[PDB]
Design a protein around this ligand. Sequence first.
Ligand SMILES: [Zn+2]
Length: 256
Amino acid sequence: HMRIHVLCDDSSQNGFESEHGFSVLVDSVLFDTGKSDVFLKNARKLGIDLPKDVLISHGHYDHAGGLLYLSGKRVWLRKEALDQKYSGERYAGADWNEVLYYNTGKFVIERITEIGKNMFLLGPANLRGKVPTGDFFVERNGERRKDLFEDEQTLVVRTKEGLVVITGCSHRGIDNILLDIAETFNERIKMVVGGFHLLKSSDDEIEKIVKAFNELGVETVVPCHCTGERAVDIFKREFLGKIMDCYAGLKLEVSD
Ligand SMILES: [Zn+2]
């Protein structure tokens, strides 16, 4: 069997700490690392040793921040995760100078990158005419542009039961993300876990997304982090499959 552990999230079960950020241990690879050391403290609570490989979904502080608490990891990030991210006038980037001092960067350039057996990183999703919601900017060279999240990447784990998809915030659209996966893998999408960033999306926008989950035959959804209570309620009432509650304690077990 293959195990998954939420090590950081906005919610938590008794005993586990929580912050605004996301981190989930997926078998032999760590997906994101929260804002601070909450992921580590939760991991110690479970008596887990973290693996060599840490994957970064995008270069926001709440996803890349706990890297400040690791050394010697192999950090899989997109080159464009290095650009300094703003959210409004608020700096929201990560300290890559420090992170890459203590750790080792593995830069992801391809659309599809194989990590280990049956594990893949998929690059920035095709926006299909949509553009990220929110007030996000990015600065390359002191040049302030709008942020399209060219740094965003998504983990796909190929299971005998179908695909397991792990996403950090889905700025490019969780629907775009799934469709990109759908065009690449002949396999069915079994489970999707992570943040979908639906707090600033309209109920219509969210229903269209749930519709895509249904259309693609997704069986189980575990919405974390950015997703939002409203959006989850819509998932619970319109998604044809099972929705699970996400929290820092959470452990999921799934077939190889
Ligand atoms: Zn983000």
